[PDB]
Design a protein around this nucleic acid. Sequence first.
RNA 1: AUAUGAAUUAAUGCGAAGUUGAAAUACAGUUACCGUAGGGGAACCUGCGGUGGGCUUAUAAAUAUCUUAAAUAUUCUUACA
Length: 70
Amino acid sequence: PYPNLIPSANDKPYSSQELFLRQLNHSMRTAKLGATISKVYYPHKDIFYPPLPENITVESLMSAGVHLGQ
RNA sequence: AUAUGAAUUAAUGCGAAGUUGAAAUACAGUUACCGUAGGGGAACCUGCGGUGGGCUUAUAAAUAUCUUAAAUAUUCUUACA
Ligand SMILES: [Mg+2]
Ligand SMILES: [Mg+2]
Ligand SMILES: [Mg+2]
Ligand SMILES: [Mg+2]
Ligand SMILES: [Mg+2]
Ligand SMILES: [Mg+2]
């Protein structure tokens, strides 16, 4: 998982790298608590979750700004 | 009317090797050319207007701004929703 990391001793505080891994553990579990986001555009998803050609509407072409000519 | 000769006479073409000016073609060294006039043996020179087939070849008196910069965007592979 995370080789070549030397933990700290229980007496002494978290180190910077231990803090990083700790907040990663927080980020993957509890940071996303409270609400789910819906109907919001995320730029990366056009690249990794493009729709199928049959599912494209005029509205989604317009929201992408395809209609704006010179 | 028309043809044929004509003394004399005007122009023009060509050719051989040369000869003389420096007018044109470059800003051709006075922008060229068109028209017209005078001068000159002539090339050309000068006056007046016109044209560009010469100047469109045209190219700065200059100064620029504030919001969560990241445990948050940048990662992401049909996922979620
Ligand atoms: Mg000359
Ligand atoms: Mg001249
Ligand atoms: Mg004279
Ligand atoms: Mg005129
Ligand atoms: Mg000229
Ligand atoms: Mg010219």
